[PDB]
């Protein structure tokens, strides 16, 4: 259930 991208 990931977040995708830069912090």
């Amino acid at each position, epitope marked *: *259930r*990931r*977040f*995708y*991208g*830069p*912090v």
Partner: antibody, heavy 114, light 114 residues
Framework: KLQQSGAEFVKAGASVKLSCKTS????????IHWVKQSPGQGLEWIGE????????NYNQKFKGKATLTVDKSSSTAYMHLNSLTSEDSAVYYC?????????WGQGTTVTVSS | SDIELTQSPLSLPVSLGDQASISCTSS???????????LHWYLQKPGQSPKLLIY???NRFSGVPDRFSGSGSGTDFTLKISRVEAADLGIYFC?????????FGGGTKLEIKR
């Protein structure tokens, strides 16, 4: 448009809730992350929370130390730190990001010292 | 067995108006199965929070000029800065979000040569 709570100066063994006020648009669209900057350990990812449904993942290291919550009503993001120690003395950033970037808060300093 | 990101060098003196390049080496492959490589570069200016330059390997954050360029693959990654300006000075961090927990490199300070 991010807005982080004021500096904290706390005893060891304390708990503090740091806060981060954003827009109603931000909260709906962006994910929220918390990040730690300390002179001992540099930059560290604490964890993330999807304000849409409150779903959250954590850096294994910060499980137990940090709890992440959101309150839709006020479009505010919260990070609870508990059992505080001198190693927790740091600048803590709240961020809003997407797959194509976003922005980081100005950051709350926490100082853990008696 | 978290992903460690090693930057080199620590401090990089450059003439203003010249090229700069900064290396970030990952202890593991950051290539995600969707084909993206989630290696990002930030710049931190003194007394301010980190700002995104380049994301998912080589994409420019909105408003970042193209004189900032990200490349690499596998485990070797480069940030090239093409026409170094004064407002480019400060500390550059790499960061991976391919694997949880997300990590940050130790930072490279871009300085003025003379």
């Amino acid at each position: 448009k991010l807005q982080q709570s004021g500096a904290e100066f706390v005893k060891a063994g304390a708990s503090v809730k740091l806060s981060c006020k954003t827009s109603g648009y931000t909260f709906n669209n962006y994910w929220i992350h918390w990040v730690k900057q300390s002179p001992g350990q540099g930059l560290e990812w604490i964890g993330e929370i999807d304000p849409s449904d409150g779903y959250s993942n954590y850096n294994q290291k910060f499980k137990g130390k940090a709890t992440l919550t959101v309150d839709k009503s006020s479009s505010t993001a919260y990070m609870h730190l508990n059992s505080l120690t001198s190693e927790d003395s740091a600048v803590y950033y709240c961020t809003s990001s997407t797959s194509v970037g976003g922005s980081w808060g100005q950051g709350t300093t926490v100082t853990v010292s008696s | 067995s978290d992903i460690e990101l090693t930057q080199s060098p620590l401090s990089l003196p450059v003439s203003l108006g010249d090229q700069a390049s900064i290396s970030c080496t990952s202890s593991q492959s950051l290539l995600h199965s969707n084909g993206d490589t989630y290696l990002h570069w930030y710049l931190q200016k003194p007394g301010q929070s980190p700002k995104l330059l380049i994301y998912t390997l080589s994409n420019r954050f909105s408003g970042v000029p193209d004189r900032f360029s990200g490349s690499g693959s596998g485990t070797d990654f480069t940030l090239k800065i093409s026409r170094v300006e004064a407002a480019d000075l400060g500390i550059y961090f790499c960061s991976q979000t391919t694997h949880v927990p997300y990590t940050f490199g130790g930072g490279t300070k871009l300085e003025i040569k003379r």
